[PDB]
Amino acid sequence: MVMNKQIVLNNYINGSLKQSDLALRTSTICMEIPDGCNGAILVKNLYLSVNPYLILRMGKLDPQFDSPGSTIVSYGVSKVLDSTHPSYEKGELIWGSQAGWEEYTLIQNPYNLFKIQDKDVPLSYYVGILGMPGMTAYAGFFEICSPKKGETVFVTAAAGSVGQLVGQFAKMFGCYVVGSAGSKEKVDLLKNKFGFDDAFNYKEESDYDTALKRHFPEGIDIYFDNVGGKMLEAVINNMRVHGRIAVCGMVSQYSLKQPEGVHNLLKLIPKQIRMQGFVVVDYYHLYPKFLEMVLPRIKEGKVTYVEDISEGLESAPSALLGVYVGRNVGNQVVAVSR
Amino acid sequence: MVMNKQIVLNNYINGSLKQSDLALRTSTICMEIPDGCNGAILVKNLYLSVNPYLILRMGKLDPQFDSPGSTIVSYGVSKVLDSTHPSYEKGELIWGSQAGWEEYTLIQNPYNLFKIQDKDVPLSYYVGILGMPGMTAYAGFFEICSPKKGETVFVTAAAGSVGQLVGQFAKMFGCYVVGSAGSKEKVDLLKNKFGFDDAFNYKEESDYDTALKRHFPEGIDIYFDNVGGKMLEAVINNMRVHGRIAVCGMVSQYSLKQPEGVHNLLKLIPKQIRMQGFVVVDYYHLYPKFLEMVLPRIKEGKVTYVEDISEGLESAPSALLGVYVGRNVGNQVVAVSR
């Protein structure tokens, strides 16, 4: 009864991303739920997330796998238009992992949806800090890395949707932190905006190992991995005993086949390194204690966050190549309406 | 006052082990402790352990590092001859990580020594099951891997000093287990002697990935890593979600420089793999609950174990190349006296 513009994929992304791999279509959708369909909500999407984890969802690996004609689904903000789930009614705002890259989405069995409880916060922050990215940074740091007071912490891609929060949580926790991003603009931004104890550009130093003792003569305890590759090789060579590595992303391998090899895995034994891959969805029962912790540190100016707004559905393809090659800054968020 | 024959190293072992790297010397030692030396024991060694972890101690890496003229020290059985530590007196037997590759060792500050409590068990088993190897297999399985009832378990080098126990503990725990060794004799031995649900030879199959779904069509949950290398690459490709990898050794890299690379580290995120390196010394406060668990399962024939005795101090160099190239079977133990 109303037209719905979807954004679909066109092939598994092994490497060399092309904008032709995203087919923008126009479909129909009824503005209310069909008969015999209880426990479902029809929503109008608003803001969608564009974080590196979606490129991993296109891997062509074994479960939860996204990838070509199927419609793209990820996190987003959506207004309930009609509902057969008594937890929701018209006009209510929510955010969850069931938002399609479309104007109107029919969610047939919502599970991890969280109520907006809107207050005065910008609505895009339930896609950034108050959504999956902030929940990812929180879960990856305190739950995985078991941080102790006054330990060395290091964050890759600290300009991304997750890293800019890992460093802020870690210094406010009470730890030495260093960040790494891929542009002069980001480095001093990461230095001036977030209070990072230090930062640098990883392609300025053509030798990762030399640059990591330049900032960590005492070794490193905690590593939040968003890049992987041979940067992960350099970290292991500098880890203190009983160090821990929370692996959230491996962006260096999204670009090309035959990913870079890691050869110093032997070091995991003599310095007893714990390395754990993780995804945010397994740590959603801790979102309450996450939010009430972030609640005060917002309006006192204690923490901050920034985005890269790209209004409209059509752009999303151009905004996805922005995070794929690293041209984006902060959090890539696309607006479909309002 | 009595001659003491030491065995020392000659160079860091990056690769290509040569027996010339072990210099057999003859030194002197007083048969009693010198004056002004409280809290020390002088011991006569008996049986020494020769497990793959000692080759790692020769790495040339950063702490606890063994390596060339310095005398080799590892686990062993020793009789207290004289003592200034009131916890020990003459004639008492113990075992710990402070046994030198010599006939008589002067231990100046014993810490992790454990009393023999001898009973009737063979004295070599406080170097095998009742010593570091059994404590390593126990700590690496139940503490690191958090095994649940009826999960898929896989053990590399299941003929080694540790793997032959990991599989026995795991099936008696209540789990499906598969082993991997490097000789026809070992495979059927591993099959007939230990009740392994299956086993194979890793160099019989010239493609590790193909052989691992041949035995695990359901995936793998737990991997006890004693080899590393590209066998670890194949395991990660077959791990179930939330799988865990306890890394005890990486023997494939002891042989050659430029160790084999692991490229599928990306898989750690979508299936949430926990990989942890570990050493036994950090889990010695659980040796009591280890021993009282093994206590019954010994003389009922429920568990077994085998060695590769090589009597005398002089051999130890020839016995060390046996585990370096894999020619040994079971547990390599050298006897220096009795």
Author numbering:
A (entry chain A), B (entry chain A): 1 to 62, 64 to 68, 71 to 341
Paper text:
Pulegone reductase is the key enzyme in the biosynthesis of menthol and is required for the stereoselective reduction of the Δ2,8 double bond of pulegone to produce the major intermediate menthone, thus determining the stereochemistry of menthol. Pulegone reductase is a double bond reductase (DBR) which belongs to the NADPH-dependent, medium-chain dehydrogenase/reductase (MDR) superfamily. In Mentha piperita, (−)-menthone is directly synthesized from (+)-pulegone through the reduction of C2–C8 alkene double bond catalyzed by (+)-pulegone reductase (EC number 1.3.1.81). Some DBRs in the MDR superfamily proteins have become important biotechnological tools for asymmetric synthesis due to their high stereoselectivity in the alkene double bond reduction. It has been reported that the reduction reaction proceeds through stereoselective transfer of a hydride from NADPH to the carbon of the substrate.
In this study, we characterized a novel (−)-pulegone reductase from Nepeta tenuifolia (NtPR), which can catalyze (−)-pulegone to (+)-menthone and (−)-isomenthone through our RNA-seq, bioinformatic analysis in combination with in vitro enzyme activity assay, and determined the structure of (+)-pulegone reductase from M. piperita (MpPR) by using X-ray crystallography, molecular modeling and docking, site-directed mutagenesis, molecular dynamics simulations, and biochemical analysis. Phylogenetic analysis revealed both NtPR and MpPR belong to the MDR superfamily, but they are present in two different clades. To investigate the structural basis and underlying mechanism of the stereoselectivity, we performed molecular docking, molecular dynamic simulation, site-directed mutagenesis analysis, and biochemical assays based on the crystal structure of MpPR. We identified and validated the critical residues in the crystal structure of MpPR involved in the binding of the substrate pulegone. We also further identified that residues Leu56, Val282, and Val284 determine the stereoselectivity of the substrate pulegone, and mainly contributes to the product stereoselectivity. We uncovered the key residues in the pulegone binding pockets of NtPR and MpPR, and illustrated that the hydrophobic interactions and potential steric hindrances may mainly contribute to their stereoselectivity toward substrates and products. This study not only deepens our understanding on the substrate and product selectivity of alkene reductases, but also provides a structural and mechanistic basis for the engineering and directed evolution of pulegone reductases, enabling the production of enantiomerically pure end-product in industry.
